[model samples]
Target: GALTESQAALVKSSWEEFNANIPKHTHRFFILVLEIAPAAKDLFSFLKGTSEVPQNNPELQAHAGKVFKLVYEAAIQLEVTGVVVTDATLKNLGSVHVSKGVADAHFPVVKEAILKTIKEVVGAKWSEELNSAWTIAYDELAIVIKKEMDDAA
Candidate 1:
């Protein structure tokens, strides 16, 4: 299963707080991502010709946002429809993944950064259980995205 009922509960509750003032966290996410893989700069076309570093860049926030948005939106799709993402959305992601040179390795890069951002913002409210829930959610999301990619190829 993509997410247990309890896991989906964790995501929805945390997401309410996470969505408030999201851009700063988005900035931090991009910084952590590039830190995880210095080579990821090439994967993010938005990083080019930019006047600011990802640690505090508005532009980086906008670009890095889709990665998190996809996860949350998929969470919604799963919670509401019991489907990971709509078929049309999967096709959209697959095409973008191919065009963006999204390597299989990139999934972990974003996953690690996303978890770190959640942990950072969550503070004392964060728990190992919450960590595991998001971990499972991200892995499942990646699986479907990869499947769509493979099918398209």
Candidate 2:
């Protein structure tokens, strides 16, 4: 689900605080915020079972792979800015996998992987902001996902 106005407001506030304090080019920082804000929104949406997966019914396993790819792309772009952008590794961006299993349905694994990847690319300071984003987003998403899973069960 997309955030309610208030939830969105709070996210933006935290984002601003974190962004302001981080060191990066203005353009890069703004782009980072833009990527993360929507990723956070979509994460919550997915957790709520309100995300439009845009694939076949009866649970398209392929959709998860697609999202993992998209997120990896976004994450790598962010990583390049903080780390360095060169020719070699960018081609290897979409190599992430979500195996065909029940655990594939879980968001936390993917979220953690994405955050940890970024943390490795950047350092503790940027990682802290990434963690903050994950924490806030996870707090909201977990409630929604838990309720939805319970209902489905």
Candidate 3:
């Protein structure tokens, strides 16, 4: 099912709050993802020893912020395009991830990490309804991402 009008409103409002501190939240998101899948760190050359000294690593911090910005851009595109992300666009993204040694299996792991980060960020404002809406949105995007990855392979 698609997001109801109210669900979309909730997401937009909550996202505004989350976006205000993108660097902080995205940095947390990456940390959580790496925790869930340690080997995933090998995908980023700059993050090799990130776990050992994240706060002191300027490059890792900058890269994390860049990643969040790209993700924010993609989310906006997905919303404006009526949740219809272009296959070509995602395919290109997937190709890049694949080149970096990402696999189809990694999408879900990232999705879970994103959801957890959102939940923590939203805190008192969090709700099952919001979770459902965001899960639907992420899953939809993940489907496209996974398909592109598979097709490329």
The candidate scoring highest on lDDT is: 1
- Runs with alpha carbons beyond 4 Å of true place in candidate 2: 1-108, 121-127
lDDT of 3 by residue, 1-153 (tens): 356666677677667777788557767877798788978876887777555536545776665555434444444455556664554667786677777878867777787887887788789888888887677676666776677777666
Tens digits of per-residue lDDT, candidate 1, 21-77, equal 667777777678778987767766577766455565566666666677677666756
- lDDT score for residue 58 of model 2: 21
List clashing residue pairs in candidate 3. Answer: none
Q: Candidate 3 at residue 38, lDDT?
A: 78
TM-score of each: 0.80, 0.30, 0.80
RMSDs, each prediction?
2.8, 17.4, 2.9
Candidate 1 has its poorest 10 consecutive residues by lDDT at 50-59
lDDT of 3 at 109: 76
